[PDB]
Design a binder for this molecule. Sequence first.
Ligand SMILES: CC(C)C[C@H](N)C(=O)OP(=O)(O)OC[C@H]1O[C@@H](n2cnc3c(N)ncnc32)[C@H](O)[C@@H]1O
Ligand SMILES: Nc1ncnc2c1ncn2[C@@H]1O[C@H](COP(=O)(O)OP(=O)(O)OP(=O)(O)O)[C@@H](O)[C@H]1O
Ligand SMILES: [Mg+2]
Ligand SMILES: [Zn+2]
Length: 875
Amino acid sequence: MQEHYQPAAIEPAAQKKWDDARISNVSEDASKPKYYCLSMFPYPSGKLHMGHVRNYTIGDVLSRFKLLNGFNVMQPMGWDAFGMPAENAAMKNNVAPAAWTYDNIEYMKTQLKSLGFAVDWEREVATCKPEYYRWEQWLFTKLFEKGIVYRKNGTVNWDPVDQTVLANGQVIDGRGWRSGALIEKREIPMYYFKITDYAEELLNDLDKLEHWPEQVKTMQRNWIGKSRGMTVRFAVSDDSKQGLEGDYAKFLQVYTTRPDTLMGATYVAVAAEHPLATAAAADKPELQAFIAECKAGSVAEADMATMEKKGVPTGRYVVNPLNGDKLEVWIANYVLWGYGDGAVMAVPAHDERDFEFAAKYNLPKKQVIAVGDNAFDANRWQEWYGDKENGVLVNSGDLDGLDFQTAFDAVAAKLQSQGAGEPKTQYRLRDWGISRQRYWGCPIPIVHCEKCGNVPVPADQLPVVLPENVVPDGMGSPLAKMPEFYETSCPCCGGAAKRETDTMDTFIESSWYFFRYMSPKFSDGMVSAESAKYWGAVDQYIGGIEHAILHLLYARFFTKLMRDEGLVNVDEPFERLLTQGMVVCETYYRENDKGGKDWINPADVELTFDDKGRPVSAVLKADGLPVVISGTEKMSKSKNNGVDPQELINAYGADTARLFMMFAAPPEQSLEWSDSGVEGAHRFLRRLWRTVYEYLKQGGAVKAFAGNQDGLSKELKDLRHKLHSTTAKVSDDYGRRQQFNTAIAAVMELLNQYDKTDTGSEQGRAVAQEVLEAAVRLLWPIVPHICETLWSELNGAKLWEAGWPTVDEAALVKSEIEVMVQVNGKLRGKITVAADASKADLEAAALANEGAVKFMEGKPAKKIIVVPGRLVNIV
Ligand SMILES: CC(C)C[C@H](N)C(=O)OP(=O)(O)OC[C@H]1O[C@@H](n2cnc3c(N)ncnc32)[C@H](O)[C@@H]1O
Ligand SMILES: Nc1ncnc2c1ncn2[C@@H]1O[C@H](COP(=O)(O)OP(=O)(O)OP(=O)(O)O)[C@@H](O)[C@H]1O
Ligand SMILES: [Mg+2]
Ligand SMILES: [Zn+2]
């Protein structure tokens, strides 16, 4: 064994050893229990950084732990390859998105290889390859013919200068981002997944997910946004019917989740596009102006909660069906057309939005709910005004005295008796719009025929292949300018026809890749029956909270769709979910002569601080002129504060990088990049290396201690106690708690105790061998390179065949104590008690002592003094 730790040498050799043994290349082996650990696959946008590495190290720790415990572990890696990153690169570097993507995949894969993750590279997928996306095209056509995918007009942001559709994140103050031109709302046919048909399933199946973080489930529940409410119809008054046609001339229908407050409605509000708004604004220019203002606004919820709620009266009136009140209709900017009926009732006394609205326009506020003996001031909103739980109804006729649910059911029965309303369930969830007017994405497998309509491409003709020899420019999608792509024949009639030129939302690739990994070369379906049956669901998913809503909802949705197609037989894709904390790092920039600022990478700057740490120098390593030190932010390409792992690996090795990530913080907690934390990890790896070297120097390897430890010295018994307490702790930290930083600390404490133990004797060396053989296996999931090498210097068996260390329970028992039993302070007996014996057990054992019971003369104990470890005194 070489004396000094040299990661640059031992890490490649360890990786070759694992690759040659194929320990991470797994089959559907029925002779071993399966375990599917999955980390969210990256966008191949250039270079991974230490944030990504933290994510993938967490998964590797979990995977290697399960591997050592004899699981057949699949840990797959892949590339989420479609999307806007490559198209922007195409407009910048004038290169094809495909070529840019594949160049990035090559570099990033070597980044991953250098870190030594136990990945099945034979299951690698790249979602931009036809062999992959043909199957989401396949599922698209199957669902299209069922109506689960459908085509309908939707609204988009049209830029009249750049000649392209814009995402809602690229429209600033109603104008384009790179143009400043006023954005037009344009209706165009697009494709949708009818996810609303699965809303109840997607909502209720969350309860099955007992090993998901509650906040993730809460966020998905709020996104789906189920409510149990009441449809309520207010008959239009006779004086207010002019210009109204059909049902809108007879009644105004609204949806409310508080039908228990219907006796407290004081006004009603409709959306600008509502037929009552249009009819009232026919002769009223002020209402036309207000309507036009509404339609020229962002219905996005982001701007709506921050929106100043405005309204105008209409002079039209409706009748509350329960108390006969005549209520005025208002047009209001917060009422959204397309959500429910586009019309709401207002109860200012018990809804905060209605309270502030009525405080602006001085509209009536009528209390219909009392919550105990609390004071109701019509001029002050209080948090209990809208309490659904502990409130009771007032001013409500025969509803007086009922709670929320009883009043809800009563109002339901009354309204249905009058034909004026009925219970109704609604959802905030909208259908999932798939169409993107972009090039670098999965083509939509639809053919447009002027005789046959929108026709799905037959499965034999799938994939519709995206041409890769394309350099987008931004002036619209190039597919729509490529007749060699879009000119085709109709698959139903054979006539001339045109391919759909929109591509799919790239969330589609990530909604099923976890199944594709189970059989990534299967050419007869999305996933082979046998591999799906073997792997079941993902046992462990690890990824950032930014994908907790959309990605996870879409993946659960696709899972149910594929199940209903008979492709898989699970209801949920991910059993356990781990949301790793963000790696954050200080940022640096320089003011650009073009106005803005240019962000510099931390590895290209030099910072010299004072003796008190006072930042006094911060120069760029390319000129030596200063640079601006800025705030500490999430590690990302955005502010160019991404630390390249290859830089860290060249300086310190993969194991140092992995150890720093796993030790610096609990995995869910944010992790600040630290040069000192890196140095601290490296020093521990040298310590570990030195420990094994100095151990083998003084005599070489022996058989590890095992079996009966009677006759072992007290110091060695204590070391074995620390050893097996550590094995128990680390096993729980990896398996149950998933807290890796404390597992490493536990192993460090064991080595601290080892360091203070004389292990030179024959028995001492056997215990030393046991401790070191355990320590290197306990740490192997974190730092497998150094642990693999150190293990082979200690022992000749394969580390993965020796398996995870076992807890020797006999090593955990401490010696028994002899306690003196006194009666009135006079020594009358002795008891032998456990070292863990409580004071109640000492009392119980002393009362039952032979010499104690005789010298107690049948008299009871007035007091029992218990000195643990010394005496019990019965008086
Ligand atoms: C399933 C798909 C929708 C996933 C999609 N392709 C994606 O998110 O790909 P992306 O390449 O963006 O990230 C890959 C993983 O790395 C994490 N991550 C990134 N930056 C950091 C950081 N500073 N600190 C900690 N973790 C970080 C991020 O949360 C994610 O789990
Ligand atoms: N088109 C609409 N635009 C704006 N608000 C509406 C619309 N339709 C209904 N509302 C109002 O939203 C209220 C409840 O909102 P929603 O349907 O989102 O349920 P919720 O927020 O879960 O319910 P709660 O307010 O009890 O928490 C209803 O009482 C109604 O007054
Ligand atoms: Mg269960
Ligand atoms: Zn046709």
